[PDB]
Assembly symmetry: D2
Homo-oligomer: 142 residues x 4
């Protein structure tokens, strides 16, 4: 219980500001932040299992399924099943998806970059691990 | 730059869930999280300077002014100027405000309490200090 | 299909502005717009059946149940069952609820009042009936 | 004043549902509803003045400027000045923008289409003109 009400007070105020900036980013890139991060993973590691994407995002497989369905609508990734093992679902960046992720890189919201440049690398790592833990608690993941 | 896109991906997903829970809390208590925290400060320390409230919330005086104007509309606090030093602005809980903060205590969103009970006290302290730093960066405070 | 994309474009832009004003109103009154309207109904007609509230709001009984649970948390209404016919659920304004609705009256967002004062009474009636129809379509009500 | 609180109650409930569906649409198409409608105008009439886009959206020129800046980030339109009259600002769909608007057509949110198919064409026209009037009142346009 301790620190909860103060954390929520700060999260509300920060979040109210961050939401405006994220709507700008969505307007400038055509992606929500989780969609963008998905594309970055696939850009980095190439074609990957949908279950690995879920693990990297700290969400359930079923949650990644919806995300991927939306990225398919935008034609940014392709989903397929391994030819012989149809249980293995592979997600892959399309040519469009690769161009979108690079464009999104350059069109990122600059106010958000400014705020986080005032946090040490080590402080960003701390926040990220706390968020990953919170996501795990919320989603019932590992 | 490192960790920024992953942090935003997680913040978006967590925030989407947290927003639903905060709307419930607003419906159940009649307060946003910063308004509730303000009332808790005034319940704890009694009548306090508006500038001290601003410091405790990591926001500018001008930001606290709007918050307090809204709490005055709900009749939960009273604002007055010291009788001889009219530069000193004091904020005080009303009888209504005291009843509201106690009621809000009991009617807090239980999903949020559940999530944060899975974080160590020390992890809550870490998140809180990171949020206070982020708020300071965003608001241009000390 | 015709007019749908234009309507959504306008609804998005209007809604983005209206959301800021509604958050102010929530801060100033401690009520969301449906909670406020519920209290106005109970102020006008006195104690009423929960099913009648649902009909007046164009929502399912189950939807009004959640709303009323939240108004009970804020202690603004009381729910009870008729003494002999326990199927009849009656909702009633408390002394607190009556004071809140009057206070909310005076603390209403003035920007919203300004916009709607530029619509004829007959245009407000048209919008209201279109919204009631849309609500009925969405909620599966009568 | 009459009908205002009821309209806001309904707008809040409808809007809460519509927001979820619009976030899906944004995920599925990479466009907010005003961005999509802009692209539809440019698809229909070809290259058009930025001032004409503003008129068609019932917003100020300055508002369309921001929208267009975001569509430029996504590379969906091109802005240029007439070669001899540099006061005349022309907006034009790119090859990417044309493909995006067609894709967006097919990936539109089906729940929204379902709701509006239950309104007569004449009722959609009424809502649209009321929204255009409301937008005009809010933006200070003609
Ligand atoms: C009825 C549609 C609701 C529209 C939701 C728009 C979301 C706006 C987010 C607030 C940030 C801003 O106002 O820029
Ligand atoms: C046009 C009015 C817009 C209404 C904003 C309501 C905010 C809803 C927040 C989303 C959470 C939920 O759907 O429960
Ligand atoms: C993580 C918590 C999210 C906070 C949601 C706040 C809603 C803000 C609505 C946008 C209007 C405004 O910015 O004034
Ligand atoms: C801190 C970032 C805030 C994230 C805003 C996400 C908007 C969610 C809109 C509510 C609809 C839904 O929950 O599906
Ligand atoms: C609190 C609330 C929202 C956030 C959004 N992005 C990064 C950090 C955040 C902290
Ligand atoms: C990220 C986004 C929103 C939050 C809201 N409350 C607590 C923690 C959070 C982390
Ligand atoms: C469109 C979108 C949101 C609204 C909110 N309140 C009144 C009218 C509206 C029209
Ligand atoms: C009220 C609130 C939001 C809306 C969004 N889209 C269409 C109609 C609407 C009416
Ligand atoms: Ni296949
Ligand atoms: Ni005084
Ligand atoms: Ni009883
Ligand atoms: Ni040029």
């Amino acid at each position: 219980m301790t620190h909860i009400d103060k954390i929520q007070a700060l999260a509300f105020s920060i979040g109210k500001k961050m939401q405006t900036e994220l709507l700008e980013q969505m307007q400038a890139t055509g992606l929500t932040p989780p969609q963008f991060y998905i594309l970055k993973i696939l850009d980095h590691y190439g074609a990957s299992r949908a279950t690995t994407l879920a693990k990297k995002m700290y969400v359930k497989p079923s949650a990644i399924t919806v995300m991927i369905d939306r990225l398919i609508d935008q034609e940014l990734v392709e989903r397929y099943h391994d030819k012989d093992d149809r249980r293995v679902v592979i997600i892959e960046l399309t040519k469009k998806g690769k161009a979108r992720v690079e464009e999104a890189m350059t069109a990122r919201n600059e106010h958000i970059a400014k705020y986080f440049s005032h946090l040490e690398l080590q402080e960003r790592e701390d926040l990220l691990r706390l968020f990953e833990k919170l996501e795990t608690i919320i989603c019932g993941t590992q």
